Ligand binder design. Sequence first.
Ligand SMILES: [Ca+2]
Lengths: 81, 70
Amino acid sequence: LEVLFQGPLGSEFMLPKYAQVKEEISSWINQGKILPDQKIPTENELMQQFGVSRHTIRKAIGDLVSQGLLYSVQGGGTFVA
Amino acid sequence: EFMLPKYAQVKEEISSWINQGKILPDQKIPTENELMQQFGVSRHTIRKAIGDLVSQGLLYSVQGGGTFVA
DNA sequence: AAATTTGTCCGTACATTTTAT
DNA sequence: TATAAAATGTACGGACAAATT
Ligand SMILES: [Ca+2]
């Protein structure tokens, strides 16, 4: 289970949920907790572990894919690039 | 096939508008609601199309302002 | 100040592709 | 070899929030 700082907005520190998810996943990649061509957790698992909607998870992941950090295979999973 | 998902057809048409110079840089494209009406699709589909085009650098958005050709 | 417009977040349903039985 | 289950993709709907007009 990973935590969301969840501070509304206006203070300098707050990020939308999808951005906090992106940061955590990017962090796994950067710290080498996941290696290229290895599968990250499924969308359902990420939903449970982060406590957010499938939409939010897909937004984070989609951003990361368009960044080049990840790639997805329909029906297979999502992997570090 | 010839088939493309709806968000991709929307992307093609907006890109087409920009490529043919029908809208110049820093000019505003139609609103999300006008696009939903014109294409006959959901706000979600429109936002997917636009978001893809923003991420590839063809467009930029301003919350409360509109979406513009880059 | 009100209305408009984009941003975030959530829910459902079904299709498509891969993976497990 | 064939079926089911699992996992991602598309599409849709709603409610509020934030920023501009
Ligand atoms: Ca406005």
